[PDB]
Design a protein around this ligand. Sequence first.
Ligand SMILES: Nc1ncnc2c1ncn2[C@@H]1O[C@H](COP(=O)(O)OP(=O)(O)O)[C@@H](O)[C@H]1O
Ligand SMILES: Nc1ncnc2c1ncn2[C@@H]1O[C@H](COP(=O)(O)OP(=O)(O)O)[C@@H](O)[C@H]1O
Ligand SMILES: Nc1ncnc2c1ncn2[C@@H]1O[C@H](COP(=O)(O)OP(=O)(O)O)[C@@H](O)[C@H]1O
Ligand SMILES: Nc1ncnc2c1ncn2[C@@H]1O[C@H](COP(=O)(O)OP(=O)(O)O)[C@@H](O)[C@H]1O
Lengths: 459, 449, 155, 437, 439
Amino acid sequence: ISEVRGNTRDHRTAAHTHIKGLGLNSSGIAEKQAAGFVGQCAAREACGVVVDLIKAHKMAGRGVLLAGGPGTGKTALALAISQELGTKIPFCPITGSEIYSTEVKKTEVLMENFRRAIGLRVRETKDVYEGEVTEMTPEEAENPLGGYGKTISTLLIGLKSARGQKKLRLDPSIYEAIQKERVQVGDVIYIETNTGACKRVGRSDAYATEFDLEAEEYVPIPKGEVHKKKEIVQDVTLHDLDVANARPQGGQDIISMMGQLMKPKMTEITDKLRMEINKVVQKYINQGVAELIPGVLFIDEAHMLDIECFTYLNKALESPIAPIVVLASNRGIATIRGADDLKAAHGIPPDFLQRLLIIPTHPYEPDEIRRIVRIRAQTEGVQLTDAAVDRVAEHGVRISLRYCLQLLAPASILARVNGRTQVDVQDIAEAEELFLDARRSANILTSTGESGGLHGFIS
Amino acid sequence: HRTAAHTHIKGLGLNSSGIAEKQAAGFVGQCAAREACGVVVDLIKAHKMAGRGVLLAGGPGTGKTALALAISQELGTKIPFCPITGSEIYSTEVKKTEVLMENFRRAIGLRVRETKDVYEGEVTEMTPEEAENPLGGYGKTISTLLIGLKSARGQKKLRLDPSIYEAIQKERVQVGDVIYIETNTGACKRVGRSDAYATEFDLEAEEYVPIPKGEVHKKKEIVQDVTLHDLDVANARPQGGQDIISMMGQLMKPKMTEITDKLRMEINKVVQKYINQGVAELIPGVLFIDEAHMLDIECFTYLNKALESPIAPIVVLASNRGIATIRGADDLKAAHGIPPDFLQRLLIIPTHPYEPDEIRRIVRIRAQTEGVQLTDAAVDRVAEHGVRISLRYCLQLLAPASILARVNGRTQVDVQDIAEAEELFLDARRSANILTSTGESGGLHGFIS
Amino acid sequence: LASKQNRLGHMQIVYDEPEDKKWTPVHALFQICERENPKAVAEITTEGVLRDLMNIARVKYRELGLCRLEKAARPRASAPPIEVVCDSRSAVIERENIMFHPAMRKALFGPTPSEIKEASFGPRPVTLYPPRALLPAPDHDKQRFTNITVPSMAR
Amino acid sequence: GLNLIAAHSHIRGLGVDADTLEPRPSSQGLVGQEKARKAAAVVLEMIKQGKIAGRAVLIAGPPSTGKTAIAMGMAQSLGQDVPFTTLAASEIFSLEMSKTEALTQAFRKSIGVRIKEESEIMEGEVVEIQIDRSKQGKLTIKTTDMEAIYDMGSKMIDAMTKERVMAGDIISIDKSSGKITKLGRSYARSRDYDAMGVDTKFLQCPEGELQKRKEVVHTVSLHEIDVINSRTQGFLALFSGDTGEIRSEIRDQINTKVAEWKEEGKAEIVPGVLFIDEVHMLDIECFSYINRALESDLAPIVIMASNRGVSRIRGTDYKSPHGLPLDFLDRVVIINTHPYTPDELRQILSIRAQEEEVDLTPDALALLTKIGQEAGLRYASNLITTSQLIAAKRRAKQVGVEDVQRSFKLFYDPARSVRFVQESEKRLIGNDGVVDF
Amino acid sequence: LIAAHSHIRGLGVDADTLEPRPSSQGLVGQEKARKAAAVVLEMIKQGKIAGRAVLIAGPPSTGKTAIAMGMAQSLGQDVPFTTLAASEIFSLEMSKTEALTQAFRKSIGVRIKEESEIMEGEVVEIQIDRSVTGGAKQGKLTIKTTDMEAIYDMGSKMIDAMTKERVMAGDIISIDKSSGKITKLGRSYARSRDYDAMGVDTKFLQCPEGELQKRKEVVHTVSLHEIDVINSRTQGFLALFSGDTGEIRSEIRDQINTKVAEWKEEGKAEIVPGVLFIDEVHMLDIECFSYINRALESDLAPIVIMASNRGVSRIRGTDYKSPHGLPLDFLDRVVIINTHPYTPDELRQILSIRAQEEEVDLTPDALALLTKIGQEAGLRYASNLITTSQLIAAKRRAKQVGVEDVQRSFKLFYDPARSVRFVQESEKRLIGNDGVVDF
Ligand SMILES: Nc1ncnc2c1ncn2[C@@H]1O[C@H](COP(=O)(O)OP(=O)(O)O)[C@@H](O)[C@H]1O
Ligand SMILES: Nc1ncnc2c1ncn2[C@@H]1O[C@H](COP(=O)(O)OP(=O)(O)O)[C@@H](O)[C@H]1O
Ligand SMILES: Nc1ncnc2c1ncn2[C@@H]1O[C@H](COP(=O)(O)OP(=O)(O)O)[C@@H](O)[C@H]1O
Ligand SMILES: Nc1ncnc2c1ncn2[C@@H]1O[C@H](COP(=O)(O)OP(=O)(O)O)[C@@H](O)[C@H]1O
């Protein structure tokens, strides 16, 4: 049905597209201009130690702070850690202004994000009979029961997959499936092994024209095996276990068929449930079935959490099953949001700050901004001459780092509109007056915007 | 068998002429408060009360709530007594005036005779008889039954509505189950398989009971103790009967709602109809609001109209505050936190501090109440701590000093055990002194200021 | 919803091949959360090591004996809902069509045994408007949906 | 016909040259704001390219200068292909969902998923239901041109039974799913019955071939996919509004499957434009989330407007330029605007005249230009309607100097209302006391 | 795994004299507070005295939560121990006072004892009668041990459990008659060679001997909060897990208290009083203290142990200061135990315990440098340096950690004493309460 378009399968350029990893040695010493970064040596070495702590499974409730001013690379190090760990270890990048809800208390969304940050890998088996039914032929028993009519000892089913067919003898108590589910000749089913009750998936596609109008889903033949003995790795976060134990998904009554029919409400979870789930996960680890994998809860903008949240974070980090908490703060002496009394460093209370491995982040040298400009330019594909690179680096040193990385898109647009392929000095000198920074905007705002009048701003 | 903070109090200890005799029935001294509390108790037990204000002033640690437990043990079991606090009424479902009125109608009781009409039988033949059901979507509908109940003396063969059949059907009554159809609501609780079908080879773990003796149509009277708030909740969220509002209303989660003025007047007229039939007896009670200064001005506004009612229990307020600021509006200061308009309703009872011998008597009573025997020098030491530090600090130095006595093989508590427990366990004043002295500067070994 | 057989869970059981490129029907394309669900894969596994996590609340609720325990509290008063005393015939008909409303009662308790007989002796399979009894199972075995208790041979 | 002449009605697109990006002055309604319109044209040309994800473009300037006019010009000059979202900032402060989620849904609305397919539907009017009680049956359907007889086997006879299809209905069958959708009855059977029911609506007969197949281009948003997968019958929630804090795991599964559809060639992702009007109403608890949601691959090119000068930030107590925190202004780019010369004011009033089909004498236009220079645009544009109406009361075709002076005499501009307030302070309730004469 | 309180294995005092040992069971280096907590533990294990208040005051990073976990490990899994933090109470679902009332009533265990009836033996035949398209079920189960041969009947729930378990002929099952669970223990025959979808060959067990109907006396411990939730709602059970309990009225609690007293007198139940630990109580406002002071007035109140950090702080929801942030009408009721900052000869052995717990081997020069760092930055920086130096020594392939690894970790990760200076140096590229510049 759906028509496939044969176009180019490209991707989009975000602000952290060029980051591809930390770019370390085999000894941990960082190396400049590698895998996207430029400079920032000690922070990348410390983040490599953090990555090693996460992959070594010795972290059990640590905490890492990322200090440093705005526009210096904290979120860049966070995405570098998330791409260095891979995909099979969880990573939940919430912000500080995402714990404030209107259905639950704000010291609960934190705990649900902890449970989102922890993964659980389960290795199991799957034994199913599979495919389209060809025959449903019974077999009369050797000794019929007196007082009844038919007496059937073994029910035969011919299952035909897309590779090979097979006759199957079954216990006769598959009949209660077949009458209740209405399985006929030409309907793909699967028969499990632990119980053995077949459930119809649908009418096959080969019988999609015996009738004309009587239509349902016409699923194809299962293009695979007829006897799957396939093993499955399965990743479930503990948040998913908390939700599936708290609010059950599929029930058979009226009120649970109104619960999934009405809106799902976040509800607070009692601590006995979490204690029980931890006590049973730590038992299935000791049996040697499930692996616990801790992840990263990168709480960006950690100065938006007020003082009522760090108190809950102390309890939550003292739990025996907890991920790492990579905070990200870019404030100096700040007033904590909850208690408007104490002016503390970073917006973090002094009691909570002792738990944190504080990693600094330094400003950039005036000969590294141009290397970041070269990497960002060859990331987007926008090519440009060297004098243009020097002018963008001049704007980068004198104004901002995030502003010299945003004079590349309008310069490229004006370049390929003017009739060229590469960006020269003229296109950036023209695009620097169509897109003012914050500094010249505040200069126009104060100088020209004298006071509130007719042709004036509203202070 | 747990010694709480208030265990030795067994009453006010009053004479026949209403004169408080000191050191009697738990209290020590405190004459002018216990005589006034005896007057309040006999004001409760005379039923000429439709809202009177009794304030219990006095500083903390002087026994304001000891008088309240004395009143609650002097009234008796069959008189309602609702103790709350000032922080309990700030709810999240309803406005706090609703919680005030729910406590006011918790504090009024009613003693009602009822005549239940049970049909207590053993089910013999259960056969439905459906009626006509034309094309209307839902299909057939059972409309009539023929359940035969079989008691010990005289069976009966009765016919049922659809709703009482659904009451049966949501109980899973087979043939043989003894039941008891309650023909007031319509409810019918299965009791068990009758012993005529008894078999030790069983698996359902059923409860086998014999055939109920007597007539199958019994009729029995009981006495019930119901407050008016129970009637308010009963008529507000219905959970009786066999219709749909009263069945889908007990599967939902229960929520406190705002029982309005009209229901609170109609239930008053229904209760007056009960009293005029010579069945029910009204017994008003006490609302003890401890820590009344936590109530804000939006509550003292509503207590005026709540006490102007023709039926309203007596209020006993406790407030350990001096000149303080009312919680609601922060620009008028008053005594006790009570606003200066609401304070005129109150019959204010003072409470005075103690003496260095009354502390000795309270320490002796508390020691012989908990079960800790000790010597007189130790009693003098604890009374010295009671004079210097606090009253309810020196009472709490008896529970470690017993345990420490049992460390050293002793039975009675001597001077050494209290001299050690005064060093292990500290009060608030010396802890604040250590706090101010040691916590000089914030840093590594400092305190978060 | 009570008479709709779910099938998009089962697609994850059958159509589970890397060659099969995660086939979904186009008329059910946007129901993504209906399609990839770990519960459906969980209910198939040989060892129930995930089925013993998905409903551990019921197992802990049963193993604490919170069903067999005698019900300690009960409400002190009960009542029928308030009705309207309006003296027309239409008011009585509207009461017996709203406060009772036999469609919901039929949908809740189940089918008439006459309807069971005409649906189970017919020549062809036919559906039922309450396809099963939609009353929820009560979560307290000794005292279900009432308040009427009795002394306990225990005491 | 639910379309009346508002303030933003003459702006039919941005009105710049599409080749060399030269803002000619009087084109497509907009007049003489050449540098800001050039910058908006550069922004629009990097929107339609759709590669560069998650910029932020602030439009500062004084009031009554054209900040929402340029936004509506960018909205008109995209078409129905690329989405656009007009969200004023006070919409976010809700009481059912928090600020973070109600601002995430603003980003989830402005990214479309585009998918092209073939719809195998069958219209038709039922003529005769023929059921063979032997299972089989025959359905006779007609249109204005054709008539056919199709076989039926077992179960859609039961679907007809559950739908209660009589002879004369207009049924429609989606043969890729197989479910009968009764559209109503025909006008050829309105003569039959006399007292109709409630549910019956009459329709014309279907026209043309029975089997209609057509290639249709569906375009949904990511917010549609998020809300449909929220609960079971949750598709009506996006019309109703009965949704709340959607979990992050659902949005994660949905972004993974949209990436998978882009890999398999089923879907094409079309990034759009989020327009946050009057961004100074957001508090710091919202900018701390905007600074992170502009980082993902699935983020629209946000265009925001602002009025205020050095003002306080709501939620905190420190002044800042444009009412925005400086860690957010290090991230955005700013296009300043400028007030208007009288030569532009005259032709803007001429365009507002020809939009409202009101004829003006040149002396009235010069007087109205002087009034607009002395009071502003929003008062001068509100005098064209009043002068037309006063001319309609005295039955004159062309408005004149007399009608504009009458409209200036009756209604007050905001420049004189302040002198009216400060002239009589003893009667207006200032903060404490009223005299009441 | 290895959390921050996994080395602690109790409180570490004597049983006859309760003298504080200077080095015993993890909690090493403090004597006064551990002896006082031993006295509190002994009067909790007595269970008689109800409604006290213990306030573990002292500077941060001095082992207050360590003493709390030492009492938690010393009571075992018998007595309830609620680890409540003070910020959890501020809900939006329920009121602020009712969350405290639930937090008190979660810490009073009720220990009841009931008789169940368990079966045992080999299933000989199953007989299930089923209707067509909805209807009841009938069941006959023939089971045989080595002695008895019984033919039991079944109801609907037993068949719904049998078909869920797939109990075939020749299984060793054990049915609890009261609760109604089925646990297959194994088989006595082998797997048949006639059917395909049979299953997995289970453990080979023989036929059990003895009797069929055996009795068992099990012990079930529920908190009072679970009794409140199961007796407050008609059908809405399981809301004691998913936290959906809105409000429990006082008519329910005043009946459940009386019934628990009656169960106490009848010998049915036994009340085990417990511990409510409140971590960092200084976050609670005065509206909480005006209820906490009066909930400690009844026979069903737990012995509250709670921590604090603050000096003269202002109480939240008010306008004035007080020691520890607690009001002086509430500080009369409490009893304050002080803790002292540590000495370096104690920090040495604490870091030695923390190093031996995380399986890290050291050199004495590195331990001396580590103690020198821990003198100036507390334990909370030193333990992180231990783990970090372990992994840096693992990166450069060294057996034991050294001075160079500790210096590397000290160079990379700042202690807060240097991050404060890092804030105070560059104040122009950090957002204070004002603007910021960019180079
Ligand atoms: N070391 C680096 N190498 C390359 N680009 C960098 C580096 N550090 C920062 N950037 C760029 O600077 C931009 C802004 O940095 P950002 O991560 O926003 O700072 P912060 O983490 O303080 O918010 C990002 O787009 C990132 O691409
Ligand atoms: N007259 C008294 N006799 C014995 N004990 C008393 C007396 N007055 C006060 N107390 C003791 O004081 C303690 C606290 O009294 P309480 O009423 O709680 O003080 P407050 O009035 O501040 O509430 C109680 O444990 C009680 O034993
Ligand atoms: N260049 C222009 N040409 C024509 N009309 C304009 C122009 N600029 C603004 N306008 C008109 O002026 C009015 C005010 O613009 P608007 O953006 O609403 O001001 P503000 O930014 O104060 O909200 C709009 O109704 C618009 O129709
Ligand atoms: N006396 C001690 N014995 C063992 N470990 C201790 C001791 N004192 C502190 N610690 C360790 O130091 C850390 C801080 O103790 P903790 O009680 O969390 O401090 P705080 O009371 O400030 O929260 C804990 O992880 C604990 O392992």
